[PDB]
Amino acid sequence: GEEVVIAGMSGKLPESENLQEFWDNLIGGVDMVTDDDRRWKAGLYGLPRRSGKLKDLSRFDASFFGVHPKQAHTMDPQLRLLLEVTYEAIVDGGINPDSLRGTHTGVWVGVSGSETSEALSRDPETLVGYSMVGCQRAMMANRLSFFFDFRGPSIALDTACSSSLMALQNAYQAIHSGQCPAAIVGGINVLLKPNTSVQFLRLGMLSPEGTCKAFDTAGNGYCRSEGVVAVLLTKKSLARRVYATILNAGTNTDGFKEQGVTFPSGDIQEQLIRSLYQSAGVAPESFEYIEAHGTGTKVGDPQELNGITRALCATRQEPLLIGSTKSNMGHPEPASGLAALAKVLLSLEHGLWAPNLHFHSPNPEIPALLDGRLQVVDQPLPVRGGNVGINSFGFGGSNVHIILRPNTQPPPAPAPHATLPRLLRASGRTPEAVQKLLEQGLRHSQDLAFLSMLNDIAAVPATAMPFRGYAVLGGERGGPEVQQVPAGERPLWFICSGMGTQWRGMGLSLMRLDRFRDSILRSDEAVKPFGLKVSQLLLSTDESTFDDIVHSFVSLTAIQIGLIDLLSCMGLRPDGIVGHSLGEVACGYADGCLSQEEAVLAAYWRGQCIKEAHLPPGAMAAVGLSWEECKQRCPPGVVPACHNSKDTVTISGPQAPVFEFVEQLRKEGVFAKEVRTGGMAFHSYFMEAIAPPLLQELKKVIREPKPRSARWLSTSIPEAQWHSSLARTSSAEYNVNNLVSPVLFQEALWHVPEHAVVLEIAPHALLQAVLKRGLKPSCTIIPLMKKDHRDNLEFFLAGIGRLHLSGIDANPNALFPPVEFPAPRGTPLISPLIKWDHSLAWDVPAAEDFPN
């Protein structure tokens, strides 16, 4: 059938708020069983004082889960915690939960108690109906399917202690047979009602010392514990991270026993173990370690270990390692299987078997312990290699056993782009949630698989995760940037700049990105017939290279096209487009009116037709007065050419009168600065003589002009004329008319809506200040390249980071070569890095809420 892997995990265990703390406690030999009065007075009714308790049951990020406060207070704490642990298990696997919505993903939850339901229905006069929706057993599974939008089976099951490993088994069968592509498996247990512990006490199942002395002579019962664990299983193809592959999972039941229903049968357990390795085609000698059910009972331990010995140790030359998580944290009953699984996977990820606590003298009823066929892990031991088995046996006789093949994927071989900086983006319910992801990303900045997975889980809408951040890794000038995301819809606008943005060496830093390089090489092919190569112009060390009009027009357009291609590969589509002068050629590419070759040829012919003609000497100057003021003050022959902002306009005309006016104006104290245009009066009647030959060349280039969309605001045609036949398409005529007409830039900027995110598409963000002045103050202005910057690749990635802060989604993973999956063993855990808004404290039943 289908290969089944464990793709992600999370959990809350005794004295452990997450799996990292669980591991620290395990490998540190910390006893997680405690003796405080968290749940009820110590020794109440003669109960043992010790039990494994979660640090907190009151926390729940209710609004992220769409739960109203009234329902949150009346929801079983097991469910409140399982909703968050489930989310963490999914992202732990590097999967964005949104990608599983509407799928036939299944949910199986192992659960045996409904104490909250009892507490909440105790008063008929005051009880509320919605406590049934938050506490009824089926909801422990159904509420997950509801929130995550999972449509596969949704089942809560009870086989007592083996519940959660039985959920794992049923989930494995559903994936193996092709019924589900993925599944959530959960295990939950809380200790709210002291009466329940009294019942177990009187059955003789509880140790008076509240300890699971697994495999030890002194074993006399188990210590009750709490636990909330979730695991994400998927078919191999869907996994990003793989902790292990499930080779087989199976169940049987003891059936009739002369000793009674609660007497465990080692003979039946042994048959289960054997039938599973036989049917998986696995040899008993291939096992390195077995996680025994190991509750530390006088009858159960020998039954189980002697069954393991007969099933697995008959022909083994080496001892078989054996451990029990229950010796470290107590017995979380139905959640026991998944807690033991978490200890196993964490041991494998760290290369060390965590050891048992409380093992001093071998149970004398167990020969393999005295003879070395079984070896208890009572010291941390390196993981050497081999399959792992896990047992979970219920007190009613339901047995489950699973065989795992650990993922041993080695770290990747050093690669070229690994040296390039990378962008890491993060989202979170709070600033601390974001900070936590960026900090760990920084700490593992060379772990490409880890960063790739983090980048994949960050695309969560700002309405759900209001804080965002980024960090450019492997660069020079970087540190984490975090901010709350301004609420509302934020339209994305592209501004393509015109002349004055070229500089020696421009684009060379971005050439290290394959997509940008490939775009440039494609532009080279367009101009090859004209003896030009864009990549060679960019490599030129001659400061005068871009003084040549054709070099600068072609190189500018090529770079703009390369930047638009980087943005497109991340799925960005602008809501608005504005070009300045020659920038309209790249706007036509961005709007989808011009192909890459047409845009590049259009910039070539525009410059070449200028080169092939003679024009009288012209000049342009930035004047410190309004458009209206300019039209009245301009001397004869001089005209307003660019309406950049309210108080800054560019004039164009005959060289002398221009230099004169600049003089006159400076006389009257007005700002006047001659621009350098190489003796050209662009955007004036002066260009008129270029029109005819340019129109002839462009008609051959743009054979089938396409209509400009409403996103694209023309700067060469006044708004009053937007319905004209000339403004309809990006035709040879449209492009010729741009050259001889004024740039109505400020006019277009006025139509940019509030809260827009504006990117400057240019080799140097020349228009930043003009943009700030002409745009509504609620706009975010982002530059993508800077003249002479040490490393424009880093500057560009910071801008993509700023895009993320603004609430726009752009995954930087797409800019770099795809990481190979599954991730290497040891890729850092993600679930413990997830933080929620846990400021509120929700109702939790008290010991007195139950009958006494």
Buried b (16+ CB within 10 A) or exposed e, 568-587: ebbebebebbbbbbbbbbbb
Q: Which of 54, 89, 86, 84 is nearest to 72 (CA)?
A: 84
CA 472: distance to chain centroid? 16
Report the alpha-carbon distance of residue 701 to residue 527 in Å, rounded.
Answer: 12
Q: What are phi and psi of 685, to 5 degrees?
A: -60, -20
Is residue 253 within the footprint of a second copy (CB under 8 A)?
yes
Closer to a second copy by CB, 137 or 646: give it.
137
Omega into 718 within 30° of 0, i.e. cis?
no
647 annotated as ligand-binding: yes
Only segment of 130-138, 318-326, 486-494, 545-553 that touches a second copy (CB under 8 A): 130-138
Is residue 65 within the footprint of a second copy (CB under 8 A)?
no
Task: For the beta carbon of residue 600, count every other beta carbon within 10 angstroms.
Answer: 29
Residues 6+ apart with CB under 8 A from 625: 633, 647, 649, 665, 670
Is residue 148 within the footprint of a second copy (CB under 8 A)?
yes
Only segment of 214-222, 337-345, 390-398, 706-714 that touches a second copy (CB under 8 A): 390-398
Q: Where does 446-517 show beta strands of DSSP type E? A: 467-473, 481-484, 492-496
DSSP 8-state code for residue 442:
H
Q: Which of residues 796-815 bind a second copy (CB under 8 A)?
A: none
Of 159, 430, 738, 811, the one binding a second copy (CB under 8 A) is: 159
Is residue 133 within the footprint of a second copy (CB under 8 A)?
yes
Q: Which of residues 168-227 bind a second copy (CB under 8 A)?
A: 170, 177, 193-196, 198-204
CB of 848 to a second copy, least distance (A): 12
Report the alpha-carbon distance of residue 33 to residue 570 in Å, rounded.
Answer: 49
Report the alpha-carbon distance of residue 53 to residue 356 in Å, rounded.
Answer: 19
CB of 73 to a second copy, least distance (A): 15
DSSP 8-state code for residue 829:
P
Is residue 128 within the footprint of a second copy (CB under 8 A)?
yes
Closer to a second copy by CB, 168 or 779: give it.
168
Closer to a second copy by CB, 113 or 588: give it.
113
Of 138, 613, 769, 846, the one binding a second copy (CB under 8 A) is: 138
Is residue 378 within the footprint of a second copy (CB under 8 A)?
no
CB of 219 to a second copy, least distance (A): 19
Is residue 129 within the footprint of a second copy (CB under 8 A)?
yes
Is residue 153 within the footprint of a second copy (CB under 8 A)?
yes
Residues 6+ apart with CB under 8 A from 638: 651, 652, 653, 654, 657, 658, 661
Is residue 324 within the footprint of a second copy (CB under 8 A)?
no
The single residue of 114, 207, 225, 331 carrying the catalytic annotation is: 331
Report the alpha-carbon distance of residue 17 to residue 565 in Å, rounded.
Answer: 44
Q: Where does 193-297 show beta strands of DSSP type E? A: 227-235, 244-253, 287-291
* 176: annotated active-site residue: no
Is residue 391 within the footprint of a second copy (CB under 8 A)?
no
Only segment of 286-294, 392-400, 630-638, 705-713 that touches a second copy (CB under 8 A): 392-400
Closer to a second copy by CB, 78 or 648: give it.
78
Contact 79, 140 (CB under 8 A): yes
Closer to a second copy by CB, 267 or 660: give it.
267
Is residue 160 within the footprint of a second copy (CB under 8 A)?
yes
Q: Which of residues 711-770 bind a second copy (CB under 8 A)?
A: none
CB of 772 to a second copy, least distance (A): 41
Is residue 121 within the footprint of a second copy (CB under 8 A)?
yes
Is residue 303 within the footprint of a second copy (CB under 8 A)?
no
Q: What are phi and psi of 143, to 5 degrees?
A: -70, -30
What is the total count of residues that contact a second copy (CB under 8 A)? 74
Only segment of 147-155, 344-352, 369-377, 701-709 that touches a second copy (CB under 8 A): 147-155
The single residue of 73, 176, 293, 643 carrying the catalytic annotation is: 293
Is residue 136 within the footprint of a second copy (CB under 8 A)?
yes
The single residue of 581, 714, 730, 831 carrying the catalytic annotation is: 581
Is residue 64 within the footprint of a second copy (CB under 8 A)?
no
The single residue of 73, 145, 161, 731 carrying the catalytic annotation is: 161
CB of 72 to a second copy, least distance (A): 14
Pairing relation of β-strands 422-428 and 398-406? unpaired
Q: Which of residues 665-694 bind a second copy (CB under 8 A)?
A: none
Is residue 442 within the footprint of a second copy (CB under 8 A)?
no
CB of 175 to a second copy, least distance (A): 14
Residues 6+ apart with CB under 8 A from 72: 60, 62, 80, 842
* 630: annotated active-site residue: no
CB of 152 to a second copy, least distance (A): 7
Please, what is the end-to-end C-alpha distance for the chain in angstroms?
Answer: 53
Closer to a second copy by CB, 396 or 412: give it.
396
Buried b (16+ CB within 10 A) or exposed e, 318-343: eebbbbbbbbbbbbbbbbbbbbbbbb
Closer to a second copy by CB, 131 or 347: give it.
131
Contact 825, 406 (CB under 8 A): yes
Is residue 104 within the footprint of a second copy (CB under 8 A)?
yes
Closer to a second copy by CB, 121 or 595: give it.
121
CB of 120 to a second copy, least distance (A): 9
Closer to a second copy by CB, 382 or 851: give it.
851
Q: Which of 352, 384, 606, 590 is nearest to 492 (CA)?
A: 590
Q: What are phi and psi of 828, to 5 degrees?
A: -55, 145
CB of 182 to a second copy, least distance (A): 14
Report the alpha-carbon distance of residue 453 to residue 472 in Å, rounded.
Answer: 16
* 714: annotated active-site residue: no
Pairing relation of β-strands 33-34 and 51-52? antiparallel
Of 396, 474, 624, 657, the one binding a second copy (CB under 8 A) is: 396
Closer to a second copy by CB, 150 or 816: give it.
150
Only segment of 159-167, 502-510, 583-591, 774-782 that touches a second copy (CB under 8 A): 159-167
Is residue 419 within the footprint of a second copy (CB under 8 A)?
no
Closer to a second copy by CB, 157 or 759: give it.
157
Report the alpha-carbon distance of residue 806 to residue 800 in Å, rounded.
Answer: 10
648 annotated as ligand-binding: yes
CB of 298 to a second copy, least distance (A): 16
* 161: annotated active-site residue: yes
Q: Which of 293, 372, 352, 278 is nearest to 325 (CA)?
A: 293
Q: Where does 166-241 show beta strands of DSSP type E? A: 182-189, 227-235
Apex 171 CA angle, 166 and 176, nearest 5: 125
Only segment of 245-253, 650-658, 711-719, 750-758 that touches a second copy (CB under 8 A): 245-253
Is residue 97 within the footprint of a second copy (CB under 8 A)?
no
CA 366: distance to chain centroid? 49
Of 27, 30, 132, 459, the one binding a second copy (CB under 8 A) is: 132
Of 123, 476, 668, 704, the one binding a second copy (CB under 8 A) is: 123
- Between helix 431-443 and helix 448-457 the angle, nearest 10°, is 160
Report the alpha-carbon distance of residue 250 to residue 830 in Å, rounded.
Answer: 30
Q: Which of 262, 32, 13 is nearest to 160 (CA)?
A: 262
Only segment of 255-263, 346-354, 468-476, 826-834 that touches a second copy (CB under 8 A): 255-263
Q: Which of 93, 6, 64 is nearest to 456 (CA)?
A: 93
Please state, in angstroms and as integers, the Cα–Cα distance from residue 628 to each residue in 639, 646, 741, following that order: 12, 10, 17
State the binding site.
647-648, 671, 773
State the binding site for an acyl-CoA.
647-648, 671, 773
| Catalytic center residues | 161, 293, 331, 581
